[PDB]
């Protein structure tokens, strides 16, 4: 189900923020287990020394959808890996398209 390479696992929002900061590469991203919201994943993104987090959860239809800023419809993907692949291009309702996968101890 959770077939993601950039899955740090159970890490506080601070850890994910410090991780991207250390990288120093825009477009970088990772995954974290929302503490306040158990069961939901958060996709962090590096941009101008910032960490944008998006709500990624699996619906009852077995699909993965991302929740971004208003005015942007949430696309439904069949696989979680397909989500990250779609965010690898402009025009996706985000601050910046992924460009530097923050591998979890596999760089």
């Amino acid at each position: 189900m959770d077939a993601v390479a950039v899955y740090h696992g159970k890490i506080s929002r601070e850890t994910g923020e410090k991780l991207l900061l250390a990288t120093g590469l825009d477009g970088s991203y990772l995954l974290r287990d929302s503490e306040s919201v158990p069961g939901v994943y958060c996709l962090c993104v590096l941009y101008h020394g910032y960490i944008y987090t998006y709500r990624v959860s699996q619906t009852e239809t077995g699909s993965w959808s991302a929740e971004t800023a208003p005015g942007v419809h949430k696309r439904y993907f069949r696989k979680i890996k397909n989500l990250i692949s779609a965010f690898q291009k402009p025009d996706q309702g985000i601050v910046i398209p992924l460009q530097y996968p923050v591998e979890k101890k596999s760089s």
Binding site: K18, L20, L21, Y50, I51, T53, R55, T68
Partner: peptide
């Protein structure tokens, strides 16, 4: 230190 997270 301040706020490196912005969420969405």
């Amino acid at each position: 230190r301040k706020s490196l997270t912005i969420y969405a």
